[PDB]
Every structure is written in structure tokens, then in C-alpha cells.
Scaffold this active site. Structure first.
Site, mmCIF file in Angstrom:
data_model
loop_
_atom_site.group_PDB
_atom_site.id
_atom_site.type_symbol
_atom_site.label_atom_id
_atom_site.label_comp_id
_atom_site.label_asym_id
_atom_site.label_seq_id
_atom_site.Cartn_x
_atom_site.Cartn_y
_atom_site.Cartn_z
ATOM 1 N N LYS B 11 -4.903 4.667 -3.276
ATOM 2 C CA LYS B 11 -5.941 3.899 -2.659
ATOM 3 C C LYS B 11 -7.177 4.746 -2.331
ATOM 4 C CE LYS B 11 -5.690 -0.123 -0.649
ATOM 5 N NZ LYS B 11 -6.510 0.568 0.386
ATOM 6 N N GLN B 46 3.444 -1.939 -3.698
ATOM 7 C CA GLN B 46 2.297 -2.780 -3.262
ATOM 8 C C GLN B 46 1.386 -3.044 -4.424
ATOM 9 O OE1 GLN B 46 2.005 -4.124 0.238
ATOM 10 N NE2 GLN B 46 1.756 -2.210 1.518
ATOM 11 N N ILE B 47 0.622 -4.111 -4.293
ATOM 12 C CA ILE B 47 -0.260 -4.522 -5.412
ATOM 13 C C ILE B 47 -1.711 -4.530 -4.913
ATOM 14 C CG2 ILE B 47 1.463 -5.881 -6.597
ATOM 15 C CD1 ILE B 47 0.399 -8.440 -5.503
ATOM 16 N N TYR B 48 -2.594 -4.084 -5.792
ATOM 17 C CA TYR B 48 -4.031 -3.852 -5.470
ATOM 18 C C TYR B 48 -4.953 -4.180 -6.662
ATOM 19 C CZ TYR B 48 -1.898 -1.133 -1.735
ATOM 20 O OH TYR B 48 -1.047 -0.697 -0.725
#
Lengths: 56, 56, 56, 56
Positions: B11, B46-48
């Protein structure tokens, strides 16, 4: 309440997660739930039923 | 595709996340999205949107 | 692959989710996983192992 | 606290979510956060900063 704010906990099994208790939720499916902020990934928070977690 | 399977990414800003690309998704809101399995927390994914991520 | 892009699926049990397959992921814990965009909540996407889902 | 348990809220923008406040969390990145159980998808809970949400 099994845990309190700031307790350090981890997932007992399956997908890993570890860090501090930062919140609480309750639903019919999960009448005692906790939000846990990752110690490795600050700012990222996941939520789990109490039975999924253990204090360390 | 900006990233491929197994790329190590993180991130860029806000909530932290770092690990390997393990999947892809696309929606109107997020036409190029990625699933990232944490390197610190194996099994947790997690997805982004692509714009949130950078390769390291 | 059990499902393909655009299939309409739902969670079989526990926490409810329903909408269309929008993506795929694979990890050791979840070697066949799917991203499902809610039909009720457009833009919101959750990810599940294939065994959690059924096509409707 | 902007919201209380049982308030009906929705996401203001981006990915949609709507249902009742079921919990609270606080972190440095999100010092006032809420868990919201979907009204459309019972048992499914997402968490959001207060600024993302509005009461309906």
C-alpha cells in the site's frame, strides 16, 4: 468481555492476524466480536468473533 | 496489467499492507484491482485498486 | 474453475453475500477463491473460498 | 459519538453499504470508526471511518 482495548491477540487458526484490540462489535451471528489492528500493518483492521482469537 | 501473480507490493498510503499479488478483480468502481496476501499474516488477503499499490 | 466472471452466486451459510463473480484469488489456504461484488451494495466486494459459495 | 448502536447508516460515496451500527473501533488512522451490519446481507459486517457514513 473476554478482551479489552489494547490487548494483544492473534488468530488461533486459519488465516493469520495479530495485533491489538481496537474495537468491538455484536451481531446475532457474532454476539461477541472484536476489531484487531495489525501490528505488522498499521492502520489495517480486521474483525473476528471472540472464538477465533486468543490473547498473547 | 500493472502487476502479475507473485509480485511483491505494498500500500502506498493510509492503512498499510504488504505481500504478494495472489489475484485480480474488476468492477466499475475498481476496473483494475488486486488481491494481496500478507507476508506478515499468511492466509490473510485484502483487495485494493491498482492505484493504491506499488511494487517493491 | 467452478465459476466464471459474471456468475451470480451466494454464500451458502453464515454471513450472507450475493452478487456476481468479479474476480479470482489463490493462496495455500484458499487455492480456489472468488471476489463477489454485492448486487445490493454496488462497488462493495468480498472474497470467499469456492466451498463457501453456490451459483444461483 | 456521531452514531449509536442500531442507527441506520449508509456509505456516502464510492462502494455502497447500508444497515445498522453494530460496533465501534478507534485507531490513529481512524480515531472514530464504526462496524455496520448489512441490511441486505445479514451477518456481513464492514467497518468504516465516521466521515464515510451518514445516518438515514
Amino acid at each position: 468481555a473476554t478482551f479489552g482495548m489494547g490487548d494483544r491477540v492473534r488468530k488461533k487458526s486459519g488465516a493469520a492476524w495479530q495485533g491489538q484490540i481496537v474495537g468491538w462489535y455484536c451481531t446475532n451471528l457474532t454476539p461477541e466480536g472484536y476489531a484487531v489492528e495489525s501490528e505488522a500493518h498499521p492502520g489495517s483492521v480486521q474483525i473476528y468473533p471472540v472464538a477465533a482469537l486468543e490473547r498473547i
